[PDB]
Amino acid sequence: NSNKLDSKHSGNYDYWYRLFRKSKLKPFERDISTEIYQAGNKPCKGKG
Amino acid sequence: FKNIDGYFKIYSKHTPDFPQGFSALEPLVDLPIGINITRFQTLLA
Ligand SMILES: *[C@@H]1O[C@H](CO)[C@@H](O)[C@H](O)[C@H]1NC(C)=O
């Protein structure tokens, strides 16, 4: 447990974690990208 | 070459259309790269 370098007044949102991926992640394989997940059939690129 | 579970493998034998006699291949390097690879190209001189 490390609540020292990862906690301070007013909060810290620096870290990140992925929930939307086109498929499963293969072991020991980094999938660094900033690509908006597709919902339905729209090619929307952005937030909303 | 191959990339099974990473561990990039390179083998090479030099014999001084295409020869028919069998040839072996000796590994020179074996290095654990462990990355995603999909396309191949060859450089020139
Ligand atoms: C490696 O590349 C293939 C082909 O683009 C992809 O399907 C696979 O998901 C990649 N590895 C990951 C991100 O686990």
Side-chain angles (χ1 to χ4, degrees):
Chain A
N1 203 233
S2 296
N3 329 304
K4 319 301 167 300
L5 309 94
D6 201 358
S7 73
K8 78 178 50 58
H9 300 294
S10 71
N12 301 121
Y13 292 3
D14 61 342
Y15 286 125
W16 293 103
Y17 83 117
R18 297 253 307 285
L19 312 97
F20 296 89
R21 197 182 119 61
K22 253 66 167 193
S23 303
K24 291 326 187 55
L25 190 77
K26 305 305 302 301
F28 290 177
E29 283 213 57
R30 164 211 271 181
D31 188 59
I32 281 279
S33 85
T34 67
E35 292 222 350
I36 269 71
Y37 170 67
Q38 190 191 11
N41 50 3
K42 217 167 305 180
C44 179
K45 180 70 183 180
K47 321 186 170 93
Chain B
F1 332 121
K2 41 181 178 184
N3 221 51
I4 177 159
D5 61 287
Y7 254 101
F8 193 67
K9 276 146 176 295
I10 287 200
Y11 315 77
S12 68
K13 167 201 233 174
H14 317 157
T15 84
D17 277 29
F18 202 58
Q20 175 68 351
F22 187 43
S23 94
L25 287 178
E26 49 180 0
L28 296 199
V29 310
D30 196 358
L31 59 169
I33 301 320
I35 68 152
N36 213 355
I37 317 173
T38 304
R39 305 156 218 191
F40 141 75
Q41 193 275 349
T42 307
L43 315 170
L44 83 180

